[PDB]
Amino acid sequence: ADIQTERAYQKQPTIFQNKKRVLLGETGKEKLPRYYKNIGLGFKTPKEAIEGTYIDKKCPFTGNVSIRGRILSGVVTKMKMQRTIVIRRDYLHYIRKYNRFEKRHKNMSVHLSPCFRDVQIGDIVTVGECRPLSKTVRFNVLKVTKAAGTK
Amino acid sequence: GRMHAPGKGLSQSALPYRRSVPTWLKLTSDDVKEQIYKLAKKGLTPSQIGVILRDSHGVAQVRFVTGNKILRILKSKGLAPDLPEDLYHLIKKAVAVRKHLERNRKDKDAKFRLILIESRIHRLARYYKTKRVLPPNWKYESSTASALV
Amino acid sequence: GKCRGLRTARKLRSHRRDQKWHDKQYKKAHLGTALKANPFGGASHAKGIVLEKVGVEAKQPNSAIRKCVRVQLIKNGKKITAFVPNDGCLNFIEENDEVLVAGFGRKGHAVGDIPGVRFKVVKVANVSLLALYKGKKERPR
Amino acid sequence: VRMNVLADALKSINNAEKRGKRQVLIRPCSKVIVRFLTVMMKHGYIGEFEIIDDHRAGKIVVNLTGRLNKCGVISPRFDVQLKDLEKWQNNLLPSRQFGFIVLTTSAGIMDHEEARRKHTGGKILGFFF
Amino acid sequence: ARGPKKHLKRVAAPKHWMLDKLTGVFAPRPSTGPHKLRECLPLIIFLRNRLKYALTGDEVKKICMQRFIKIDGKVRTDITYPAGFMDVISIDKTGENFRLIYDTKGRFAVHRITPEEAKYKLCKVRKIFVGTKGIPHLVTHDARTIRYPDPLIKVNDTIQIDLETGKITDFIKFDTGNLCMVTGGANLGRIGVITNRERHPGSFDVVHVKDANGNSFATRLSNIFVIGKGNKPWISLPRGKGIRLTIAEERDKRLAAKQSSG
RNA sequence: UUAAAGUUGCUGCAGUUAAAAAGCUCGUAGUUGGAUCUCUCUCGGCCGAAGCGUUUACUUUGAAAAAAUUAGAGUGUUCAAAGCAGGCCGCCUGGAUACCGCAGCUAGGAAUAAUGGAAUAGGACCGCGGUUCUAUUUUGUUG
RNA sequence: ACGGGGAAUCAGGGUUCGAUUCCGGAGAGGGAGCCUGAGAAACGGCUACCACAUCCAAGGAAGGCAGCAGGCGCGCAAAUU
Q1: Nearest chain C Cα to D74, which residue?
Q2: Which residues on A lie below 8 Å from E204 (Cβ)?
Q3: Which of B55, B79, C120, D109 would disulfide-bridge B40, Cβ 3.0–4.6 Å?
Q4: Based on the domain organization, do D43 and D94 belong to the same domain?
Q5: CA E90 to CA C130: how far, in whole Å?
Q6: Is strand G in 7 Å reach of the CB of A96?
Q7: Are strands E191-198 and E206-210 parallel, antiparallel or unpaired?
Q8: Location of the Glycyl lysine isopeptide (Lys-Gly) (interchain with G-Cter in SUMO2) covalent cross-link (chain E)?
Q9: What's the rounded Cα separation, in Å, for the pair E40 and E50?
C-alpha cells in the first residue's frame, strides 16, 4: 500500500476503523471517515486535507499540533529532506553610527504537509509557531502563495 | 558610452513631434500589415522590414500607422522566430570569430574579442530569461552554438 | 570617492575596522606585542633589587654623565636601567637595595639626553628620594 | 550614468547663478524637480519658469533673480523624524532667520517649517538659502 | 537559586509603596495570597507607613496579635498579608473601615467608608468552568471559587459579594457605556466610561475609555475593572474622582490654595 | 583613558609633485540605478459589528516597557552636596513629570523607494444552460 | 570577556569603561556520583578518585573562609580576631 509504507500501521488516532455495521456496508464502499480540524486565525483548511488519505501527525489540519505564538513569512529555498523544507527570511539591520542599513538573512526549517502539493522553490509561505517538532523545527506551513512567475 | 569600447558617440535617430501619419500616405493599416507578412516570409528580420518599408513605401513608423510594433504583429500572426534577432546576431558573430580561431592560434586579439562577444551574449541571455522569453534551462554552449544558428 | 548608499553600513564599518590597524597607537594598544615586551607588564610602578651602579654618557650636543642604576625586577626577573634624578642622590643608594621604580614621563620613550632609559627611581628602602634629598628622613639602620 | 536627476537640476541652477546669468535650462524635467522649484519660487528665490514638452522627459527654462546663495541636494534621502529636524537645520542652514530645508512627506513636498506646522516627518530632499 | 526566594530589597519593592532609601536594606516581602506581589499593599506598610498607628515593625505585630484588624471580615495576624484592590479593612476598636482604591497617581488611597459599605465588595471574573457532575465554577481576581453562579455571568464581568456569606448579590456585564477603573499600566487609577473594544484574536484586546471631562485613553482588556452600570459607580470614590490633572492644572490648583489661606 | 584629533574623517580627511590609483580589460556576489499613471456587500437600534486596498519600507499616534541613576517640579538640611520630607492653630499636604535605541504589538497619512495586477487571453462583469457531490427546512411525530 | 540597568568624556556626531551593593547567570580546591526532600546533582550534606594537609600509642580518625574578623603568600596596590 502507498499509505502503509512504514513498519507500523498508520491511522488517525481519533478515527475508529473497525465498526462492524452490516454486510451491506462491506459491500457498499470502504472509505474511512477522516479527522480534520479548523486551524483558525482566519486561515482556511485546504481541500486536499479533507479529501486526502495521507497519515502524518505533525500536519496542522489533520494532525496533533496546535498553532500559537508568532505568524511569519518566508521564501522557499530548499526541498530536499523528507517532508520538511528550508526557507529564507531577508531583513535590514540598522547601524546607527552611519545612519544606514545592511542586509541580513536567516535560514529556518519548517514542516511541509502533504495537503500543500505542487509547491516549487521560489514562492512565499506563511508559517505559524508550534511546539518543538524536532531538534531544529518549531514552525509549520499555513499558506502557500505562488512566486512572481505565476502560471 | 559604449559597453565594451571607450567610444562616446552620439549618432542616433530623432523622432519628430508629429505622432500623426501625413496626408500623402494613403496606405491603410491592413494594407501596411500585408506587406509586413509578405516580407516576413522572405526571411527578413523586423529591423530589415522597417528599413525596406521606410525606403520604399513612405512608411516612417508603423507604430504611428497601425498602432502596433513589427515584432508584435509577427508574433500575433505567428511569424516570430525562436531566438530574438539581437541574440541571434550575437551568436552568429561568436561562431564566426570562433571558426577563424582554429586556423589562427596565434591571433591573440580575436581571443579577446570573442570573450567580449560572449559576455554580451550572457548579458542578453540573462535579460531574456528574467523576461520568460527563453526557457530557464537555456544555456549558451560555445561548441553547440552552431546548432542555434 | 567613498560609497554613500543607504545599504552601505557593512562596507563602512568593515573598512573602518581594517583601516584602524594602520594607526600605530591603535595597533600598539590592541595587538598585544607591546604589552608582553613591557617590563612593568602594564603597571605604573614596580619594585626591584639594585645590581650595579652605572653611568650613562649624554647624547650630543650635551656632554655630561647621567647617573643611573641597574635594577632587576622582583615580579618577573627582568633587568632595567633607572635614572637617579636629583643632585647627589646616587649617594643614597647602595647595592642589593630594594627600590621603587616608575616610568620617566613619555610612555615607554626615552627622555632628553639620556639614551635608552625609560625609568626613574622614586623610593629607596621605603624612603622617598625627595625626603632624603630635602633632609626629612634618613636611611634606616 | 545619470542617477538622481534632481541633483543635476540643482547643480545646473547653482552654477549658472554664479555666472550672473538670467536664465537656465534644466533637462530632463521631472515632477520632483517641478515641486522643488515651486517650493523655491513661493519663497521669492527664483521666479516664474516654464516647461517645454518633447513627447519625452521635457525640459525647463528658469528665470533667475540673483537672490540665491546656494541650492543643494542631499543623497541619500535620509529619513527625518520631527525630533531630529533641529540638528539637520543646524548642520545645513546658515542662520536661524533665513534658509530652508526641503523634505518630502506624506502630505507633500514642503519646507521644514510647514512640516512642523503639520506635525509630520519625512525624507530629506535638499536645501536652499 | 535552588528554590523560592524569601527576601525583598527596598529598591526592588513596588514603587507605589513609597518606601524611602535610607530606612533599611530590606522591604517586607508579601506573603503568598489572593493578590500578586507587585499589585498588593502589605498590612505593615498600611498600619505603620500610611495610618501611622505604629512607629516600628514590632508595634505592627502587637496590634495584629491582639486581633484588631479584619480583612474582608476575617482576622489576619500576618503582618505581611497581601491586601489588594477592593479589599475592606476593618478596625473595630477605633470603628474605622477602609477600602483599597487607587488614586489618580497610581497609589493606594486612604479611603474611609461607612460600616454599611463594608458589607460587600466588587470582584472581577477571571475563569468559568464546569466541574465534576456538571457544576459551574467561578474564579475571581480575589482567588474566590464560587460555585452555582448565574449562567449570564461571563468572563471580564463584575459581581458583588456579601462578605458575611460570600455569595453573589448582583452583577454587571462588560459592555460599552459602563463605568470602569484602570487597575494597571500607565492609566492606573483612572475612571471612565467604556466606548469601544477592538479585538485582536491570538493577542490582547484593547478597550477605549473616555473620562467625564472628555479625555480619552486606551488600555489592555486585562487592566479594566467595571465599577458601575452607566455613569453611576457601585462603590464610593476617592477625592480625585478618577480624573487625571495635568501638571500645569495641578500647579494652578495648588497655588490657588495658599492664596486662600490667610 | 576621553577631549584636543577634521591626525580614522557617517557628519568630516587625503591619493600630479609631501605617504598614496591595481599594467590593462572582462566578470559573479555586494553597492547604485532615466521619463511616465488624480472602500464596501449582510446583521443589532441615519451608525456600529465583518471583509480588504497587492505587499512592504517610511512618518505620526497609541499601550507595553523594575527601581536606583540622569533631566526635572515642590520643599530655608542654618546654606550646600544630600534627603523625601513637611506646613497651620487636632487639621492641611506631598511623595510629580519627562526620557527609556533596535526588534515585536496598534491605528491614521500615501509624497518618496521597491512590488504585483489582461498579450497561447486559462481576462473582468452580466445573465443562461448541463455533470457530480451535497443542505437536512416541509408532509402534527416516527420509517 | 560574566551579561544588562549604568559610568567618564562631549558643540553635533562619537570614543572608552562597567570584578563592584539592583536584576539575571555561575561556582564553593579539581572532576564525578548520589541520599533526603515540594525544591539541591547542596558542599557551614554524604560517597569515591586527583592535589594538598591535620592528630596518633602506627592499630586508626578527621578535612574544605570565593561567609564575618584575622594570619601567610602575592604584589604598585586595599581597614577591627
Answers
A1: C4
A2: none
A3: B79
A4: no
A5: 77
A6: yes
A7: antiparallel
A8: 229
A9: 14
Tell me the domain boundaries of chain C. Answer: 1-141
Distances (CA, A) of B124 to B87, B134, B141: 7, 10, 14
Residue type, A124: I
With an 8 Å Cβ cutoff, are D54 and B15 in contact? Answer: no
Residue A29 CB in 7 A reach of strand F: no
Domain layout of chain E by residue ranges: 1-116, 121-171, 174-244
The resolution, in Å, is: 2.9
D50 and D100 share one domain: no
CB–CB of A98 and C9 under 8 A? yes
Looking at residue E9, what DSSP letter applies? B
SS3 E3: coil
Contact E210, E224 (CB under 8 A): no
Q: Report residue C28: phi and psi, to 5°.
A: -60, -45
C-alpha cell at E47: 498600619
Q: What H or E segment, with its residue span, contains residue C123?
A: strand C119-124
The helix/strand/coil state of B32 is: helix
Residue whose C-alpha is closest to residue A126's, from A79, A88, A72, A77: A72
Q: How many CB atoms lie within 10 A of CB E47?
A: 23
Technique employed here was cryo-EM
Q: What domain range includes position D63?
A: 1-68
Interface of C with A (CB under 8 A): 5-10, 12-13
Contact, C35 CB vs strand G, < 7 Å: no
HEC per residue, E94-114 = CCEEEEEEECCCCCEEEEECC
Query: Taking the CA of residue C22 as centre, how many other CA atoms within 13 Å lie in the half-sphere pointing to its CB?
Result: 5
The set of residues, in sequence order, having a beta carbon less than 8 Å from that of C32 and lying 6+ positions away, is none
Q: Are strands E158-162 and E167-172 parallel, antiparallel or unpaired?
A: antiparallel
Shortest-distance nucleotide from C75 CA to C1': G75
- Do D43 and D93 share a structural domain? no
Set of chain C residues whose Cβ sits within 8 Å of the Cβ of A91 = none
Whether D6 and D63 map to the same domain: the answer is yes
The count of structural domains within chain D is 2
D98-104 long-range contacts, CB within 8 A, separation 24+: D98/D129, D99/D127, D99/D128, D99/D129, D100/D39, D100/D43, D100/D127, D100/D128, D100/D129, D101/D126, D101/D127, D102/D36, D102/D39, D102/D40, D102/D126, D102/D127, D102/D128, D104/D32, D104/D77
Q: Nearest Cα to E6, choosing from E37, E34, E35? A: E37
Amino acid letter, residue C130: L
Nearest residue of chain D to residue C8 (CA atoms):
D76
**Min CA distance, C16 vs chain D (Å)?**
20
Nearest partner of E189 among E108, E86, E82, judged by Cα: E108
CA-closest candidate to residue E80, choices E131, E26, E127: E26
D4 & D47 share domain: yes
Separation of alpha carbons E168 and E160, rounded Å:
6
Residues of C in Cβ contact (< 8 Å) with A103: 7
CA angle B97, B98, B104 (to 5 degrees): 90
Domain match, D62 and D112 both: no
Q: Distances in Å between the alpha carbon of C75 and those of C47, C78, C93? A: 8, 8, 21
* Separation CA E145–CA E139 (nearest Å): 5
What is the C-alpha to C-alpha distance for residues E224 and E182, in angstroms, rounded to an integer?
A: 5
- Check whether residue D101 and residue D124 sit in a common domain: yes
Closest CA to D61 of D72, D53, D51: D51
Does the N-terminal peptide bond of residue E82 adopt cis geometry, omega within 30 degrees of 0? no
Long-range contacts of D63-67 (CB under 8 A, 24+ apart): D63/D22, D63/D23, D64/D13, D64/D16, D64/D17, D64/D21, D64/D22, D64/D23, D64/D24, D66/D17, D66/D20
- State how far the Cα of C18 lies from the Cα of E37, in Å rounded to an integer: 53
